[PDB]
Each structure stands twice: as structure tokens, then as C-alpha cells.
Amino acid sequence: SRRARIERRTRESDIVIELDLDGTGQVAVDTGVPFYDHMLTALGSHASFDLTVRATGDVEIEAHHTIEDTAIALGTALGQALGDKRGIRRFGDAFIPMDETLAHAAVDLSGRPYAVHTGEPDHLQHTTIAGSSVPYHTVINRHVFESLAANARIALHVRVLYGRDPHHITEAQYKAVARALRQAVEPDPRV
Amino acid sequence: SRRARIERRTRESDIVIELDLDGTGQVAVDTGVPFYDHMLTALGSHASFDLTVRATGDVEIEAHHTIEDTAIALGTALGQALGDKRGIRRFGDAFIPMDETLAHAAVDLSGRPYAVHTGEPDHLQHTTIAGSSVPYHTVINRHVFESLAANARIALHVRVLYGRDPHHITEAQYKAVARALRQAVEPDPRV
Amino acid sequence: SRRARIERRTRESDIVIELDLDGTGQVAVDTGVPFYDHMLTALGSHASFDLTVRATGDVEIEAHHTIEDTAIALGTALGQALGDKRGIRRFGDAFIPMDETLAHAAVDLSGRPYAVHTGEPDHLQHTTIAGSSVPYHTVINRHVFESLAANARIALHVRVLYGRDPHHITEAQYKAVARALRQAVEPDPRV
Amino acid sequence: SRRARIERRTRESDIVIELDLDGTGQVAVDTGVPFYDHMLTALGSHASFDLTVRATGDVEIEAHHTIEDTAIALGTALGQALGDKRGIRRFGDAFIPMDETLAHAAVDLSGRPYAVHTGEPDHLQHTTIAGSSVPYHTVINRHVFESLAANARIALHVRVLYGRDPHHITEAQYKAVARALRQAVEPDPRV
Amino acid sequence: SRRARIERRTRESDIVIELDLDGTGQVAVDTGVPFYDHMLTALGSHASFDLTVRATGDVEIEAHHTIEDTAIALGTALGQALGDKRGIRRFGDAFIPMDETLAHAAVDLSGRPYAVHTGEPDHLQHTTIAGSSVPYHTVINRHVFESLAANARIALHVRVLYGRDPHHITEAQYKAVARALRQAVEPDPRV
Amino acid sequence: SRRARIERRTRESDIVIELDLDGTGQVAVDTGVPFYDHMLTALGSHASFDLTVRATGDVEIEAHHTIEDTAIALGTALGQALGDKRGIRRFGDAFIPMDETLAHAAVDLSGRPYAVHTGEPDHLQHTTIAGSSVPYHTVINRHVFESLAANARIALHVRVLYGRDPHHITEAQYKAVARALRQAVEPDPRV
Ligand SMILES: [Cl-]
Ligand SMILES: [Cl-]
Ligand SMILES: [Mn+2]
Ligand SMILES: [Mn+2]
Ligand SMILES: [Mn+2]
Ligand SMILES: [Mn+2]
Ligand SMILES: [Mn+2]
Ligand SMILES: [Mn+2]
Ligand SMILES: [Mn+2]
Ligand SMILES: [Mn+2]
Ligand SMILES: [Mn+2]
Ligand SMILES: [Mn+2]
Ligand SMILES: [Mn+2]
Ligand SMILES: [Mn+2]
């Protein structure tokens, strides 16, 4: 059994995560930031986790604090569910083509906490993905992966090999992280 | 006693500031611009002021006029609370690391009115921090520090040594200004 | 059962494809273009498909139309054999070193139709691989992968990381596509 | 009372740290790596900690694992001794001139775990400080500060403004970190 | 059974290798060069080989001849244990993040003997990893991979995508080679 | 008691310095070079020294010899007043904004004698500040700080981060040196 429930209440947000590493993609995410909900739903589903995320935070300021607190709590849940990490593949990686975009992620689940994020085009430092509700500033992508790696205590390297559309670029990264995690957490039949 | 109450009514906004330089961080800010509220709350708290700010303005146009009028009134309140400036440290400075960002501020409280703002990355000239309410255009950061310095009649130099995330870059600057002010207004035991 | 038989008759060529995704590498290819036969035999074998390809076309003009029509028909056969794509890994990728060459391919079998081809050295835009029969112009490699992706309705990204010999560069790409497809079409035990 | 005792046994090393944040510079360090002993003795002394460090590790390979494990354990001890961090200055910074070298460090003790290391001249990426015993590869300086920040869960920014001699450059950084920590952990009389 | 015992006696060194491709990571390496012992122990363990290596050589000159003779003997043992290579995955690759470093290796076990080594930073051409015993000159990394590929008669491509610390850069490469070999030697259930 | 009286008679000048490190800014300076008097008065006052300086020298040639001899004598007085340096902060630094100029100084009072002066704009190498009496050539600023550091036997690093007006640039440096010294000579309550 590799499950964790994390509650994290701060001045800026209130978060509950329930995570099962050995799931079937049963995912429900509600943070008040719908593009982030979409990204974390893709992450949970493509990692074949079961994942529920309920977050409320100070989105009148912007999504940053809610996005960051959620990623901290999620990284904490991941590290706690991994337990002693015995018998697992440990290393995982995944390429994700998404139309014109190609992204990649590589992880070491027993590596020191460390995140490296490279290749994302410069326009994503000031791009906004905006709909009818709270918008998502793609400059936060790097922050999400850093917070996940720092709190799960894993090495996480995310690369954009190339791409143009900011939604493709972002979604392909979250999916690459997802499928790298999926490979790395699997039981290793020879360890 | 180093307190000031400033009311400033213009065609564009109505502002009330109550400031105590010798406070404990009791801060309440409501300008209609929630990311600005967050910045001025960090400023008051990290300066160990007691500060209330109540502003209403023409945010249907954008936050600029409200942000500017508030900073003018706040600078006026600061200069009035400082009184004759006798016996104070006068000079203060502070570095603020915030994840990948490092900012710095230096002040001379008896210097001529003057503001110098350097190092902020170019993408902050056209970045927007947007949530569920009135957004904040980071190009205004420079204007806020200029207006504060002009109306408090102080020298205020704010630097971004490096950084990426616009919220970190902005918040680290407001906190650096805050802690520089905190040091400079303190009684100097040798003057 | 994941099989398809495609017949495609055009003014320029007559093609029959029989494809089984769940094969053991039983492959027989005869297009009149022997280096292309070699490439498609490597593709079928390294994908662990069973594949027969019988093509006759207007090779008095050059191999292009036969090569293109065959790749269209093959992509069509692949998409038809995949059926509803339920329960499959969906994503696949493969590196292929071949002496001095390193190539890579990544696929998303449920992605929109899309092909990206990068890194192939410039001399392959005007190289000919010539033997005793109809020659093969390596400029067509990109066209083959585009036609496959367009008609299988998949995302296919093919990269040459480096290399020199045009036969190694070409063959390593076809094998990389092959092993990426092999991984992606496999049943996924967790979906 | 702000004390911590950390024992850390790994396959590569065995470490015991005893730390008191409110000390008088009573420092004893023995890691088997004498230049590192010198650096950590300067760190403990200039931070006005009381610090004992006893480390034995696989220095037949090189000092890296012992240096890294010691810095991990020390960062852990620092974070544990800080406890709830209430009432402290939180922010601290220090410039250290050392002959031709000038270094600087800035910390946020309640900031997310984060380290930024800039300005160190390129020759320190492959310099060795060698005496009669196990040598010290200055490329590890960055690693030490990263490991400290990661495990104390603090923001630590270390800069070399300029310098030439690798011993001055290194020692000035450790002292700058030391005096930044010393300032940041002090009780803040206004919080 | 996929085992080999190689003895190699030259004027410069005396080597015994015992290798089992189908092992559980039972590894014991003693070459007189402790950082090399560490690298080959990581290689055997991450490849899930069982591997014993006993080497004595002319380390009064330097480790080169012992390192090279050991890698020749090990490559010979690998090729002999692979036997006819029937039924195996043949191709394998692995990404290894190690803090700031990312390395990758790709292999073709039935490819002609060939090694390509790219991306290692220039400072590794003259870096020394030195402890209390015989040191390791990182310029030899390329030589080790060449000798392995030449004598196992395999294609081995090793890449450093990026990195800084010479121990991370080196160790990540040996682990990447290890996990690429592990994947490639596995029985392929469809061949 | 931390006081020193230095008399220095040379062929070029006659100097008397009386210095008290623990003063209240009671300063009287008369060297025959009124802009230098202004600079040394700012230095004594902002350092919270009590300082009298009486110098007469060969100002028919130019102020250099008088300026240099005075700075030598003053540095000597500082080092003699510091005595054994026990129990002091040792390190000190200060930023000084002055309208458009920002300067900084950092000191180590127990460091080897050493001065580093950087950032001063090139026009100060040939600028003259001239009034009704003996003029001041700003090229001498560097010389003053060198002579002070050499004879007080301290490390003194002075930086101009930016600026334009030569009087602001010069005065901000002398004040920065002053406030760095003030911090460094203070009793350290923990040493
Ligand atoms: Cl790659
Ligand atoms: Cl600075
Ligand atoms: Mn943040
Ligand atoms: Mn989408
Ligand atoms: Mn305006
Ligand atoms: Mn914030
Ligand atoms: Mn065509
Ligand atoms: Mn061939
Ligand atoms: Mn390490
Ligand atoms: Mn030293
Ligand atoms: Mn050799
Ligand atoms: Mn290691
Ligand atoms: Mn001179
Ligand atoms: Mn003046």
C-alpha cells in the first residue's frame, strides 16, 4: 500500500491531497485555477495515480500561492507514499510529443532533492493562459516542478526540446513528468 | 511618538493612511488591487510599522491611478511621521532572497528626494499579475518606488540583482524597501 | 486481433498492405525500390509487426510516387489496425545507435496527426543511395514519416542527434520509428 | 534553547553533529578532510555557534561523499535547532573581504529551500587545494551550500563579487554564509 | 546461463573478471583505484549484474593502464556472456539525473563495435578526482567507454546533456551505461 | 578607552591627528584642502568618531602630499586606537545612496592590509573639484583609501555601484567607509 493524505493550511491557502501511487487514473482536482486543474489532472492520470486535490486559496491576488502550496503538498504526498522506496525502478523518463512540441522528463526517486528545467521558449516567461476564470501564468511551470522536486525529495529534470504553443508546451511537460514518475515508482522485478 | 494620518482625495481616488513607524507589524491594506494589497502588507509588516491603508479609486480604467495615489499618500505619511529625523540611523539597506530572486534596497532618510531602480528584467515592463480581481501591471513597480521617495523626501535605491518569476521579483523588492526603511528609522544609540 | 489489409490503387501505383500489430517480425516487402524495401523490412521487423507490402508504381519517373503511396497506405493500415486504441501504452520512443549515427523517434498514438523531423544533416537533402536497381533519394525520408503520421493519425517526431553516413542515418531513423511504435502499441497493463 | 544533535550513517560515511545556535564559537570539526575542517570551523566560529562535527567516510575515493554527507547533516541540524523560527530576524547578510577577494551571502531562514551561487571564477571548477592529507576540490563549494540550504530548508544566496586566490575565494564564502546565518538567527526585539 | 570468467595478464596488470548478466547486483570491485572501484560498482549494481573484479597493476605510473586493462577485460566478459544474443531486447538506453547533471547512454548489443562520447564539459579533460589513494583522471572516462565497446563488440553512445560537478558527471555516465545495458540484455518476450 | 594621538612631520607636511573610536561625531578638520576637509569631516562624523585633524603641507605644488600624509597618519591613528581588536564586530559594511550615486564599503579590521577600489567612473581619473582655495583631484580618492588601509592594517574594499556627479561619487564613498568602520569597531556582544 503506497498512499498518503496531506493537509496543508497556510495563511494563503487550504489544501487536501489524497494520493495512491498504485492507482488506475482516478483523478479529481479542484484548485480554483482551471488550467492548473487540467495540468494536475493530466499528471495524475498519465502517472496512473489515483489522486484527489482540493485547494482553496487567495486567487484574488493571483494563482501563484495556490499553485505553489498545492505543488508543495503534492510533492510531500508523493515522498510520503513512496515510503522506503525499496524494490522500485527508481529511475524513469518519458518523451511527450504534442503536435509541434516535444518535451521530456527524467527522474531519480532516490536522488537528492534537485530540479533542472531547460529549453522552455522565452515567451513562456510572460505568457498567460486565460479563460473565464482565474488565469495561469506559464512562468510558474518552473516553480511547480521545483516545488514538487523539493518536497518529494527527488531529482526531476524537465526539458522542452522544441515547441511553440504555450498550452502544448506546458501540457507536454506535465505529462512527461507524469510518465517519468509512473515508470520510476513501478516495482522493479530484479531489485 | 512617530505617527501620521494622511487623507488624500483626488478626482481618481480617495485614500486614508494611518502609519506608526514604531509598530509591531499590525497591518491592514485594502486598495481594490489585491496584489498591491499583498505588496503593501508585506511592506508594512517587514518594516515593523503599524499601517492601515484604505483606498478606493478608478479601477475600471486600471490600477495605476489608485496605486500611484496610494504610494504618494504613503510617502507623505512616512515623511510626516519621521518628523525632524533626529537621533535615527538615517541609512538602511536590506537584501531579500526569494527562491531564485535576489533584490536589495538602500535608503538615506535625510537625503534629497531621489529614486533609482535598476536590474529588473525587461519582461517586467509588460508583465501582468492577474487573479480574480483587478490586475497588477509590474511596470508600475518603478513608479511606486519613485512616488514613495518623492513624497517621503528620501533617497531610495532599489536593485534586482537577478531573478525570473515576476511575483518573486516584485515581492522581494517591496520587502527589501521595507527592511531598509526598518533599519533606517530606528533610533541610533550614538546620535 | 489488430490486423488490417489496405489496397490502394492510384494512377501512379498499385499497393497492397497486410499488417498485424501483434506479430513476430514476419515481414516481406517488394516495392520495386530495393533500398526502400530494406527500410520498410527493418521497420516491420523491429516493430515486431507481421507485414507484407506489395507495391508496383511508376519508377521510370523515380521512386517518389511509389514511396509516398506505400507510406500513405501503410499509415492507413496502422491506424485501422489500432482500432479504438483502448488499453495501449499510447506513448513510445526509441534511441538507435548505428555506428557513428544516433537517431531517436517519439510517438503519441492518440495524438493529432503531426510529424516533426529534425537534425538530419544537410547533405541528405540531395543524397542518392544507388545500387543495381531503382535508386533512393534520401530527401524523401522526411516525406515518408510525414505520410505515415498523416494517415495513421498519430504524432511522430523523428530526430537525428548526429551522424554521417546516409545509409546509417536513414536506417537508424526507420528503426527508431519502428521501436517507438512497438512500445506504443503494446497493451498497457494499468490502463 | 536552540540545540540539535544529528547522527547520519550511510554506506559512505558516519557523521555526528552537535549544534547550538546560541553559542560563543566553541567549535571542533574533524571530517578527515583538513581544508574542509578549516572551512566548517570558520563557519561555526564566525556564526557564533557552538559546533562539534565528527565525520568518517570513504576518503580513499575522494572527499566528495564525506563533504556532502556532512553538509546534509549540518543543514538538518540547523533546521532542527531553529525550531519554529518565531521571534528571529529571519533575514541576514554579510560581506567578507579577504585580501583581494570580496564575497557576500544573503539568507532567508523562513524561505523555501533554495540555493543560488554566482560569481565564483571559472578556475574554481577544477582547482584542488592540496596539503599532506585528503585534498579539497573547490568545485564542491557550490554543492556544500546547496546541501546546506536543501536540508536546513532555507534560501541561501552566495556571491563572489571578485577574487583570485582559491583559498581566499572559498574561505570568504564560508565566512559570509556564517555571518549571514549569525544575523538571521538572532532574536528580533520587534517580532 | 549467461556468465563469463575472464583472466587477462599483461606486463602492466593482472585482471580477473567474473560476470553474470542475470544477477541481482552482487558486486565486488578492487582495482587499486578506489574512484574507479566506485564507478564499476555502480555499473555492475545498476546493470543488475553479479560482478567481481580483481585487478592489480602499475599504479605507481598512474591508473591509466589498470583502468584500460580492466575495461578491456570487462568488455570481453560482457561479449562472451552475451553468447549468441538470441532473444534479447538488443537496444537499451537510460537517462540519469544526478543533482545538476543529466547523462544518457544508448546501446545496440548486436551493433558493430563503436563508441561515441559527446557533451562532457571541457574541464573534465584535465580534472583529477583525488582522495587518500591512487587518483582518477576524468579524461579517462571516454577511454573506458571506448574500451568496453571495442571488446564487447557493441555500439555504445554516451552523452552528457549538461552538468558541472566532475564526480556527478562521471558517475551519471557510468550509471547510464549500466541501465542501458540492463535494458538491452533482458529477454525480449516477442523475439 | 580607544584613543590615539599621531604626529607625523615629513619634508612635505606636518600633521596632528587625535582620534577616539568611541566618540559622538565631534570632528574638526583643517588640512588646507577644503574639499578634503569636508570629506574627512564626513568620515569622522558618520563613523561616530571624535576626530581632530590639523595638517599643513606643500599645497603650492598641489594637495597630493598633504592628502596622502594625512591619510597615512589617520590610518596609523585608527590602527593604534583599535589596540588588540578583542571583542569587536571586526567586519562592517555600508551602502550610501547620494542622489543618483550608490557607493558601498566593506571592511575586515583584523584582515591583512589590503585595499580594492572598483566601479568609480573613468572621468574621476582626471576630474578636479575646485573652489576658492586649493583644489581636489578626484584621482586621489583611490590613494586615500589605499593609504588608510595600508597604515591601519585592515582590508578595505570600496565600490561605486553607479553614479555621475563627482562630488556625490566621492562623498558617498567616504561616508560608506565611515559607516563600515563604525559597524566594524563596535563591541560585539557575543565575542
Ligand atoms: Cl535527448
Ligand atoms: Cl552588491
Ligand atoms: Mn513562490
Ligand atoms: Mn489541453
Ligand atoms: Mn503615473
Ligand atoms: Mn507572495
Ligand atoms: Mn510527394
Ligand atoms: Mn542497411
Ligand atoms: Mn554529490
Ligand atoms: Mn585559511
Ligand atoms: Mn590507453
Ligand atoms: Mn559517488
Ligand atoms: Mn602618492
Ligand atoms: Mn558635499
In DSSP notation, B168-189 reads HHHHHHHHHHHHHHHHHHSB-T
Of the candidates B49, B50, B51, B56, the residue with the CA atom closest to the CA atom of residue B70: B56
- Distances B125 to B36, B65, B143, D3 between C-alpha atoms, Å: 16, 17, 11, 47
Region of residue B86 (phi > 0: left; psi between -120 and 50: alpha; otherwise: beta): beta
Residue appearing with cell numbers 575565494: D169
Q: Measure the CA–CA gap between B169 and B43, rounded to whole angstroms.
A: 14
Q: Identify whether the C-beta of residue E180 lies closer than 8 Å to the C-beta of residue E105.
A: yes
- Distances F75 to E6, F69, F114, F186 between C-alpha atoms, Å: 74, 10, 12, 17
Contacts of C84 (CB under 8 A, 6+ apart): none
Specify the DSSP class assigned to residue A179: H
* All cell numbers assigned to B121: 528584467
Of the candidates C163, C23, C44, C185, the residue with the CA atom closest to the CA atom of residue C95: C163
**CA quadruple F59, F64, F67, F71: dihedral, nearest 10:** -150
With H, G, I as helix, E, B as strand and everything else as coil, classify residue D27.
Answer: strand
Of the candidates B182, B93, F186, B53, the residue with the CA atom closest to the CA atom of residue D190: B182
Contacts of F39 (CB under 8 A, 6+ apart): F144, F170, F171, F174
With H, G, I as helix, E, B as strand and everything else as coil, classify residue B100.
Answer: coil
- Distances A130 to A36, A40, A167 between C-alpha atoms, Å: 11, 17, 11
Give E58: exposed, middle or buried? Use CB within 10 Å, 0-12, 13-18, 19+.
middle
Specify the DSSP class assigned to residue C128: E
D187 touches chain F (CB under 8 A): no
B96 touches chain D (CB under 8 A): yes
DSSP string, B114-138: EEEEE---GGGGS-EE--SSS-EET
Of the candidates B117, B125, B120, B129, the residue with the CA atom closest to the CA atom of residue B163: B120
Q: Measure the CA–CA gap between E13 and E69, rounded to whole angstroms.
A: 7
Q: Identify whether the C-beta of residue F88 lies closer than 8 Å to the C-beta of residue F112.
A: no
Say if the Cβ atoms of D128 and E130 lie within 8 Å. Answer: yes
| Backbone CA torsion sign across A130, A133, A138, A141 | negative
Q: Phi and psi (nearest 5°) for B94?
A: -160, 135
- Distances A115 to A156, D97, E34, E175 between C-alpha atoms, Å: 5, 32, 30, 19
Residue appearing with cell numbers 544533535: D5
* Nearest neighbour of A62 by CB, restricted to B99, B130, B164: B130
Q: Are strands E27-30 and E114-118 parallel, antiparallel or unpaired?
A: unpaired
Compute the C-alpha angle C81/C115/C175, nearest 5°: 65
- At position D139, the amino acid (one-letter code) is V
Of the candidates D127, D177, D184, the residue with the CA atom closest to the CA atom of residue D156: D177
Q: Measure the CA–CA gap between D44 and C36, rounded to whole angstroms.
A: 70
Region of residue E174 (phi > 0: left; psi between -120 and 50: alpha; otherwise: beta): alpha
* Nearest neighbour of D106 by CB, restricted to B48, B97, B99: B97
Give alpha helix (H) positions in chain B. Answer: 34-46, 64-82, 140-152, 166-185
Paired strand residues for E15: E8, E55
Residue appearing with cell numbers 571516454: E142
Paired strand residues for F18: F5, F52
- Distances B140 to B65, B146, F33 between C-alpha atoms, Å: 10, 10, 46
Of the candidates A14, A38, A60, A11, the residue with the CA atom closest to the CA atom of residue A144: A38
Of the candidates E124, E104, E134, the residue with the CA atom closest to the CA atom of residue E116: E104
Paired strand residues for C156: C107, C115
Q: List the subunits that have 3+ CB pairs under 8 angstroms with F.
A: B, D
Give A181: exposed, middle or buried? Use CB within 10 Å, 0-12, 13-18, 19+.
buried
Q: How far is the CA of E121 from the centre of ligand 11 (A)?
A: 21
**CA quadruple F76, F77, F80, F86: dihedral, nearest 10:** -110
Give D77: exposed, middle or buried? Use CB within 10 Å, 0-12, 13-18, 19+.
buried
Nearest ligand, measured from the Cα of E98: 9
Q: Measure the CA–CA gap between E158 and E94, rounded to whole angstroms.
A: 10
Specify the DSSP class assigned to residue A125: G
* All cell numbers assigned to F124: 574621476
Q: Identify whether the C-beta of residue D49 lies closer than 8 Å to the C-beta of residue D20.
A: yes
Q: Identify whether the C-beta of residue B173 lies closer than 8 Å to the C-beta of residue B158.
A: yes
Give alpha helix (H) positions in chain D. Answer: 34-46, 64-82, 140-152, 166-185
Q: Measure the CA–CA gap between D157 and D107, rounded to whole angstroms.
A: 6
* Nearest neighbour of B98 by CB, restricted to D118, D155, D190: D155
Q: Measure the CA–CA gap between D91 and B180, rounded to whole angstroms.
A: 12
Q: Measure the CA–CA gap between E35 and E72, rounded to whole angstroms.
A: 18
* Nearest neighbour of A60 by CB, restricted to B127, B133, B166: B133
Q: Measure the CA–CA gap between B77 and A108, rounded to whole angstroms.
A: 54
Q: Identify whether the C-beta of residue A32 lies closer than 8 Å to the C-beta of residue A103.
A: no
- Distances A42 to A25, A184, C88, E80 between C-alpha atoms, Å: 9, 17, 17, 46
Residue appearing with cell numbers 576518503: D59
Q: Which of E129, E136, E137, E139 to mutate to test the interface with D (most CBs of D within 10 A)?
A: E129
* All cell numbers assigned to A158: 524537465
- Distances F47 to B179, C154, F55 between C-alpha atoms, Å: 22, 74, 20
Q: Measure the CA–CA gap between B135 and A129, rounded to whole angstroms.
A: 15
Give alpha helix (H) positions in chain A. Answer: 34-46, 64-82, 140-152, 166-185
Resolution (A): 1.8
Q: Measure the CA–CA gap between E128 and D141, rounded to whole angstroms.
A: 16
Length of chain C equals 191
Give alpha helix (H) positions in chain C. Answer: 34-46, 64-82, 140-152, 166-185
Contacts of F113 (CB under 8 A, 6+ apart): F149, F150, F151, F152, F153, F154, F155
Contacts of D121 (CB under 8 A, 6+ apart): D160, D163, D164, D169
Q: Phi and psi (nearest 5°) for F4?
A: -150, 140
With H, G, I as helix, E, B as strand and everything else as coil, classify residue D128.
Answer: strand
Say if the Cβ atoms of E99 and A106 lie within 8 Å. Answer: no
With H, G, I as helix, E, B as strand and everything else as coil, classify residue D125.
Answer: helix
Q: Identify whether the C-beta of residue E165 lies closer than 8 Å to the C-beta of residue E65.
A: no
Say if the Cβ atoms of D61 and E127 lie within 8 Å. Answer: no
Q: Identify whether the C-beta of residue D71 lies closer than 8 Å to the C-beta of residue D158.
A: no
D40 touches chain F (CB under 8 A): no
Q: Measure the CA–CA gap between C90 and C138, rounded to whole angstroms.
A: 29
E129 touches chain D (CB under 8 A): yes
With H, G, I as helix, E, B as strand and everything else as coil, classify residue B87.
Answer: coil
Q: Are strands D128-129 and D136-137 parallel, antiparallel or unpaired?
A: antiparallel
Q: Identify whether the C-beta of residue F107 lies closer than 8 Å to the C-beta of residue F180.
A: yes
Residues of F in contact with D172 (CB under 8 A): none
Paired strand residues for A107: A92, A156
* All cell numbers assigned to E160: 552528457
With H, G, I as helix, E, B as strand and everything else as coil, classify residue C26.
Answer: coil
* All cell numbers assigned to D159: 556571491
Of the candidates A134, A136, A82, the residue with the CA atom closest to the CA atom of residue A113: A82
Q: Identify whether the C-beta of residue C17 lies closer than 8 Å to the C-beta of residue C73.
A: yes
Q: Where is chain C broken, named by the residue before each break, C–N > 2.5 Å?
A: none
SS (H, E, C) chain E: CCEEEEEEECCCEEEEEEEECCCCCCEEEECCCHHHHHHHHHHHHHCCCEEEEEEEECCCCCCHHHHHHHHHHHHHHHHHHHCCCCCECCEEEEEEEECCEEEEEEEECCCCCEEEEECCCHHHHCCEECCCCCCEECCHHHHHHHHHHHHHCCEEEEEEEECCCHHHHHHHHHHHHHHHHHHHHCECCCC
Region of residue B119 (phi > 0: left; psi between -120 and 50: alpha; otherwise: beta): left
**CA quadruple F59, F65, F67, F72: dihedral, nearest 10:** -150
With H, G, I as helix, E, B as strand and everything else as coil, classify residue D37.
Answer: helix
Q: Measure the CA–CA gap between C186 and D164, rounded to whole angstroms.
A: 58
Paired strand residues for A155: A108, A114
Q: Measure the CA–CA gap between E99 and D64, rounded to whole angstroms.
A: 13
Q: Measure the CA–CA gap between D10 and D16, rounded to whole angstroms.
A: 12
Of the candidates A58, A66, A69, the residue with the CA atom closest to the CA atom of residue A31: A66
Residue appearing with cell numbers 511504435: C181
Contacts of F100 (CB under 8 A, 6+ apart): B114, B116, F162, F163, F164, F165, F168
Say if the Cβ atoms of F157 and D96 lie within 8 Å. Answer: no
* All cell numbers assigned to D83: 525550531
Contacts of B66 (CB under 8 A, 6+ apart): B12, B13, B31, B32, B33, B36, B55, B56, B57, B58, B59
Alpha-carbon F3 to chain mean position: 17
Q: Measure the CA–CA gap between F149 and F117, rounded to whole angstroms.
A: 11
* All cell numbers assigned to A111: 536522488
Q: Which of B22, B50, B95, B161 to mutate to test the interface with D (most CBs of D within 10 A)?
A: B95
* All cell numbers assigned to E27: 558486486
Contacts of C176 (CB under 8 A, 6+ apart): C94, C95, C96, C103, C104, C105, C158
Q: Identify whether the C-beta of residue A160 lies closer than 8 Å to the C-beta of residue A139.
A: no
Q: Phi and psi (nearest 5°) for E187?
A: -55, 135
Q: Measure the CA–CA gap between E41 and E135, rounded to whole angstroms.
A: 17
- At position E18, the amino acid (one-letter code) is E
SS (H, E, C) chain F: CCEEEEEEECCCEEEEEEEECCCCCCEEEECCCHHHHHHHHHHHHHCCCEEEEEEEECCCCCCHHHHHHHHHHHHHHHHHHHCCCCCECCEEEEEEEECCEEEEEEEECCCCCEEEEECCCHHHHCCEECCCCCCEECCHHHHHHHHHHHHHCCEEEEEEEECCCHHHHHHHHHHHHHHHHHHHHCECCCC
* All cell numbers assigned to F190: 557575543
Residues of D in contact with E166 (CB under 8 A): 126, 137, 139
Residue appearing with cell numbers 529588473: B120
Of the candidates C79, C80, C26, the residue with the CA atom closest to the CA atom of residue C53: C26
How close C158 gets to chain E, by Cα (Å)?
16
- Distances B99 to C4, D93, D155, E165 between C-alpha atoms, Å: 55, 15, 6, 22
- Distances E90 to B26, C9, E21, E86, E184 between C-alpha atoms, Å: 68, 38, 13, 9, 5
Q: How many CB atoms lie within 10 A of CB D83?
A: 13
**CA quadruple D9, D14, D19, D25: dihedral, nearest 10:** -170
* All cell numbers assigned to B154: 528620501
